[PDB]
């Protein structure tokens, strides 16, 4: 498997934003070992779910799927940072996921807004999905979003078990 | 459902119900819609989730389809004879206990005997004692005529069906009328079937006639290195038939050669179908048996059988080599009417040989030119 | 320290030569006796459709344009002994058997 956003857009053309959010929710639950999920309000503000706590650090997350370079979208990020602390006062870190790529100036501006708020931002740009954490470890999840014909990987299991059944009869 | 944002962000109704919970001594854990989206439900338990979130067929539907098949296959099988508003049963509890015992000590059991003797009815009595607690499935040997074994299991495979029972220690599959496997031109799907069942530690039972018994025993000893259990079921003895006659209230035939026929439960079932007023309608019984057992629908069968019987009576020989059409004796051997041994072919029951000679005399009477030519 | 020879030959006869067809056994017995009776190496037996071609594809019987022959001497010996057994069962008297 390999990251291909044309395959993604062809598969999920009725709703791209909603499916990208689920891809990030599953990867977040794998990364921070929350296998039974997280509480979420309807129309939740600022960040995508309620925060988690770990080693006295409080963490949330946010995802955006865009056709533009991130420099065109600065106002969303400023709004995100300000609207989060209004709702969840103790928040310490936000992790941000996107299909885009940007060091450049706009990143410094949005980092300053976060810094004055006291909030750390971690950026998961397109090069994150090239990582073996996505491709090699979480392969079963990645195969859902990047493959046009996911059932082909069942056929490559069926023939393999057939081969093991045939050679069981043979005596050496 | 999900709650709407007003924990510090909770709306008033939620904190009201949470307050009543605490005042009753209770903590509530809330699992709203975002639970069902999580890896525990979606990745780890996908086989369960697919039943409820999808309109396609699922593993629960596969197990249901196979249970229906088992109930349909055993519907026709008869376990007793019904006669003058009363039911007649041969006691089989000894055989049934031997089968229960063998399945504990051994993995594979072969149940064997001549045709019509009751091999499938015993399986029906096992099934009625276990269908609730234990997995129990029956397949006909006719079914393995496929290109792949996965054709029997829909869009799932054999390995899926097997994995659905991995937490059960007692679990049984029956292959019924195993001697029909000799009719298959391709035997590879059946061999893969057995390989998966042996690896996953199922218990397996076969019903077979005597002609295929050594082949089954050889295959399990040579390939899978298992020595199977063997059980044999037999016709009645004369004392047993006398006690059946006395206790259930029917008179036995006077003809010695008919008495030898009704020691087999299938033919006893036919005898009591033509019985009224303490005697049998012999002509109807004779007509039914000739047309349904010997002729069926082929002239070539009737011609072959008549020639075989007359050759035995003319040469004074038990074993003969008849000049039949090129496949008819094999069909009559598979039916169990004619027998084979290295010395030749022979006829199994005496009553049929008498009936054959009488028909042969009728034909020679129809075709004769004069009486002296007939007797010659 | 020995083989159980009668079991060895019984398994081999039933598995290799007979399989599950009576016609194969009758064909092979006829083929062995005709060679032993006529003195010929190559013979042309009277048999049912396809049986000799099936035995050739098993390698049990061999073929050249002059006729058919038996591949292994050990199987021909077993065939002749079985034919003698059959004639012993079917006799009316001893003089007929030796004829
Ligand atoms: N316990 C019994 N008491 C009385 N009659 C019985 C009993 N069991 C079986 N029969 C009779 O024997 C008949 C044949 O039984 P069944 O179908 O089990 O034979 P089978 O040995 O499986 O034969 P096949 O080799 O032809 O498959 C039944 O139709 C029924 O009439
Ligand atoms: Mg049966």
In the structure encoding, which two tokens stand for residue C34, read together?
A: 């005709």
Q: Find the B117 Cα to ligand 1 centroid distance in Å.
A: 5
User: B196 — contact with chain A (CB < 8 Å)?
Assistant: yes
Q: Find the B296 Cα to ligand 1 centroid distance in Å.
A: 21
For chain B, list the contacting chains (3+ Cβ pairs, <8 Å): A, C
CA angle B126, B130, B133 (to 5 degrees): 165
Instruction: Please tell me which of the candidates C23, C48, C90 has its beta carbon nearest to residue B319.
Output: C90
Instruction: Please tell me which of the candidates C20, C48, C86 has its beta carbon nearest to residue B342.
Output: C86
CB of B92 closer than 6 angstroms to any ligand 1 atom: yes
Instruction: Mutate one of A37, A49, A86, A87 to test the B interface: name it (highest B CB count within 10 A).
Output: A37
Tell whether the torsion through CA atoms of B340, B346, B351 and B353 is positive or negative. Answer: positive
CB atoms B330 and C22 under 8 Å: yes
Q: Find the B87 Cα to ligand 2 centroid distance in Å.
A: 21
CB atoms B333 and C22 under 8 Å: yes
What residues does B4 pair with on adjacent strands? A42
Angstrom distances, CA of residue B218 to CA of B106, B226, C11, C25: 16, 10, 9, 20
Instruction: Please tell me which of the candidates B214, B330, B342 has its beta carbon nearest to residue C82.
Output: B342
Chain B: closest CA distance from residue A153 (Å): 15
Instruction: Please tell me which of the candidates B37, B150, B223 has its beta carbon nearest to residue A25.
Output: B37
Q: Find the B257 Cα to ligand 1 centroid distance in Å.
A: 21
- SS3 per residue for chain C: CCCCHHHHHHHHHHHHHHCCCHHHHHHHHHHHHHHHHHCCCCECCCCCCCHHHHHHHCCCEEEECCEEEECCHHHHHHHHHHHHHHHHHCCCCHHHHHC
CB of B78 closer than 6 angstroms to any ligand 1 atom: yes
At B232, give phi and psi (nearest 5°). -125, 135
E strand or H helix at B323: none
In the structure encoding, which two tokens stand for residue B333, read together?
A: 């051997």
For chain C, list the contacting chains (3+ Cβ pairs, <8 Å): B
Q: Find the B193 Cα to ligand 1 centroid distance in Å.
A: 28
Mutate which of B140, B174, B266, B335 for ligand 1 pocket (most atoms within 8 A of beta carbon): B266
Q: Find the B118 Cα to ligand 1 centroid distance in Å.
A: 3
Pairing status of strand B86-88 against strand B81-83: antiparallel
d(CA B119, CA B212): 15
Q: Which residue has the tokens 């009553």?
A: B351
B115 CA: nearest ligand 1 atom: 25
Please give the torsion angle defined by the CA atoms of residues B117, B123, B126 and B127, in that order, rounded to the nearest 10 degrees: -140
Q: Which chain B residues contact residue C86 at CB under 8 A?
A: 342-343
CA angle C41, C42, C43 (to 5 degrees): 120
Burial (CB count within 10 angstroms: exposed 0-12, middle 13-18, buried 19+), residue B346: middle
CB of B209 closer than 6 angstroms to any ligand 1 atom: yes
Angstrom distances, CA of residue A73 to CA of A67, A83, A85, A126, C65: 10, 16, 20, 16, 90
User: B372 — contact with chain A (CB < 8 Å)?
Assistant: no
Instruction: Please tell me which of the candidates C14, C23, C29 has its beta carbon nearest to residue B214.
Output: C14
d(CA B112, CA B141): 15
In the structure encoding, which two tokens stand for residue B200, read together?
A: 């996953």
Question: Residue B246: left if φ>0, alpha if ψ -120 to 50, beta else—which one?
Answer: alpha
Question: Residue A83: left if φ>0, alpha if ψ -120 to 50, beta else—which one?
Answer: alpha
Instruction: Mutate one of B183, B218, B222, B343 to test the C interface: name it (highest C CB count within 10 A).
Output: B343
Q: CA end-to-end span of chain B, whole Å? A: 99
Mutate which of B94, B119, B121 for ligand 1 pocket (most atoms within 8 A of beta carbon): B121
Number of residues that make up chain B? 376
DSSP assigned state of B108: E
In the structure encoding, which two tokens stand for residue C65, read together?
A: 């344009």
B231 neighbors B111 (Cβ within 8 angstroms): yes
Instruction: Please tell me which of the candidates C25, C48, C49 has its beta carbon nearest to residue B342.
Output: C25
Q: Give the SS3 label for residue B319.
A: coil
Which residue owns the Cα nearest ligand 1 atom 16?
A: B118
Question: Residue A7: left if φ>0, alpha if ψ -120 to 50, beta else—which one?
Answer: alpha
CB atoms B2 and A42 under 8 Å: yes
d(CA B233, CA B237): 12
CB atoms C49 and B326 under 8 Å: yes
CA angle A53, A58, A64 (to 5 degrees): 110
B327 neighbors B336 (Cβ within 8 angstroms): no
Work out the number of other CB atoms within 10 angstroms of the CB of residue B202. 20
Pairing status of strand B108-112 against strand A52-54: unpaired
d(CA A79, CA A87): 13
Q: Which residue has the tokens 């990251």?
A: A3
Mutate which of B73, B74, B78 for ligand 1 pocket (most atoms within 8 A of beta carbon): B78
Pairing status of strand A52-54 against strand A57-64: antiparallel
Q: Which residue has the tokens 């996921």?
A: A97
Q: CA end-to-end span of chain A, whole Å? A: 38
Q: CA end-to-end span of chain C, whole Å? A: 42
Architecture of the domain defined by B58-248: 3-Layer(aba) Sandwich (3.40)
Work out the number of other CB atoms within 10 angstroms of the CB of residue B75. 7
| DSSP for chain A, written as a single string | ----HHHHHHHTTT-HHHHHHHHHHHHHHHHTT-TT-----BT--SSSSPPEEETTEEEEEEEE--SS-GGGGHHHHHHHHHHHHHH-TT--EEEEEES-----HHHHHHHHHHHHHT-EEEEE-GGGGGSHIIIIISHHHHHHHH-S-TTHHHHHHHHHHHHHHHHTT---
CA A120 from chain center: how many Å? 18
d(CA C75, CA A151): 54
Q: Find the B183 Cα to ligand 2 centroid distance in Å.
A: 16
d(CA B145, CA B123): 24
B181 neighbors B145 (Cβ within 8 angstroms): no
- For residue A92, give the nearest of A132, A134, A122 by alpha carbon: A122
Angstrom distances, CA of residue B209 to CA of B156, B333, C24, C38, C84: 33, 12, 21, 41, 30
CB of B124 closer than 6 angstroms to any ligand 1 atom: no
In the structure encoding, which two tokens stand for residue B152, read together?
A: 């029997």
DSSP assigned state of B164: T
d(CA A122, CA B375): 114
Half-sphere exposure of A138 (CA within 13 A, CB side): 23
DSSP assigned state of B274: S
Angstrom distances, CA of residue C3 to CA of B34, C7, C58: 73, 9, 26
CB atoms B195 and A169 under 8 Å: yes
At A81, give phi and psi (nearest 5°). -60, -45
List of E strands, B273-317: 275-276, 279-280
d(CA B365, CA B361): 6
d(CA B210, CA A146): 59
Q: Which chain A residues contact residue B159 at CB under 8 A?
A: 161
CB atoms A39 and B159 under 8 Å: no
Q: Which chain A residues contact residue B30 at CB under 8 A?
A: 39
Residues 88-127 of A with CB under 8 A from B: 88
> Which ligand is the nearest neighbour of the Cα of B234?
1
Q: Which chain B residues contact residue A22 at CB under 8 A?
A: 37
B354 neighbors B310 (Cβ within 8 angstroms): no
CB of B118 closer than 6 angstroms to any ligand 1 atom: yes
d(CA B201, CA B169): 8
Across A94-103, b (16+ Cβ under 10 Å) vs e yields bbbbbbbeee
> Which ligand is the nearest neighbour of the Cα of B118?
1
């Amino acid at each position: 498997v390999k990251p291909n956003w044309d395959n993604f857009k062809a598969k999920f053309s009725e709703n791209p934003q909603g499916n990208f959010e689920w891809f990030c929710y599953l990867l977040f639950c794998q990364e921070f070992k929350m296998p039974a999920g997280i509480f979420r309000y309807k129309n939740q503000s600022g960040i995508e779910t309620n925060p988690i706590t770990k080693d006295n650090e409080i963490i949330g997350w946010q995802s955006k799927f865009y056709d533009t370079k991130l420099s065109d979208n600065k106002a969303d990020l400023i709004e995100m940072i300000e609207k989060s602390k209004k709702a969840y006062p103790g928040l310490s870190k936000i992790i941000f996921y996107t299909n885009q790529e940007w060091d450049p100036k706009i990143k410094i501006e949005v980092d300053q807004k976060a810094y004055e708020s006291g909030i750390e931002i971690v950026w998961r740009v397109a090069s994150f999905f090239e990582s073996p954490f996505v491709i090699v470890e979480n392969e079963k999840i990645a195969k859902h979003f990047f493959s046009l014909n996911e059932s082909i990987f069942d056929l490559l299991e069926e023939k393999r078990k057939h081969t093991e059944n045939v050679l069981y009869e043979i005596q050496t | 459902q999900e709650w709407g944002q007003g924990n510090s962000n909770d709306p008033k109704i939620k904190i009201e119900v949470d307050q009543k919970a605490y005042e009753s001594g209770i903590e509530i854990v809330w699992r709203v819609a975002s639970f069902f989206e999580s890896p525990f439900v979606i990745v780890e338990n996908e086989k369960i989730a697919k039943h409820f979130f999808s309109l396609n067929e699922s593993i629960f539907d596969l197990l249901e389809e196979k249970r229906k098949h088992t109930e349909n296959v055993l519907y026709e099988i008869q376990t007793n004879i019904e006669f003058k508003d009363r039911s007649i049963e041969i006691d089989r509890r000894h055989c049934i206990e031997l089968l229960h015992e063998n399945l504990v000590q051994k993995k594979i059991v072969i149940v064997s005997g001549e045709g019509g003797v009751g091999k499938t009815a015993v399986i029906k009595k096992i099934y009625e004692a276990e269908k609730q607690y234990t997995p129990f499935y029956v397949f006909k040997a006719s079914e393995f005529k496929k290109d792949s074994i996965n054709e029997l299991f829909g869009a799932h495979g054999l390995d899926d069906f097997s994995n659905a029972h991995q937490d059960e220690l007692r679990k049984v599959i029956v292959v019924d009328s195993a001697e029909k496997l000799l009719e298959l031109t391709n035997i590879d799907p059946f061999k893969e079937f057995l390989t998966v069942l042996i690896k996953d530690k199922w218990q397996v039972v076969f019903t077979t006639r005597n002609n295929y018994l050594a082949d089954l025993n050889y295959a399990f000893i040579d390939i899978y290195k298992i020595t199977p259990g063997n059980l044999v079921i037999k016709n009645l003895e004369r004392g047993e038939l006398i006690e059946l006659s006395d206790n259930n209230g029917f008179s036995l035939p006077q003809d010695v050669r008919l008495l030898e026929l009704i020691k087999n439960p299938f033919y006893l079932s036919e005898y009591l179908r033509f019985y009224t007023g303490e005697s049998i309608d012999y002509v109807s019984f004779k007509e039914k048996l000739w047309n349904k057992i010997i002729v069926k629908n082929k002239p070539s069968r009737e011609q072959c059988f008549l020639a075989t019987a007359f050759q035995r009576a003319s040469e004074g020989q038990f074993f003969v080599s008849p000049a039949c059409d090129t496949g008819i004796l094999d069909e009559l051997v598979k039916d169990g009417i004619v027998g084979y041994e290295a010395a030749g072919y022979f006829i199994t029951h005496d009553i049929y040989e008498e009936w054959a000679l009488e028909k042969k005399i009728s034909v020679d009477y129809i075709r004769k030119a004069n009486n002296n030519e007939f007797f010659e």
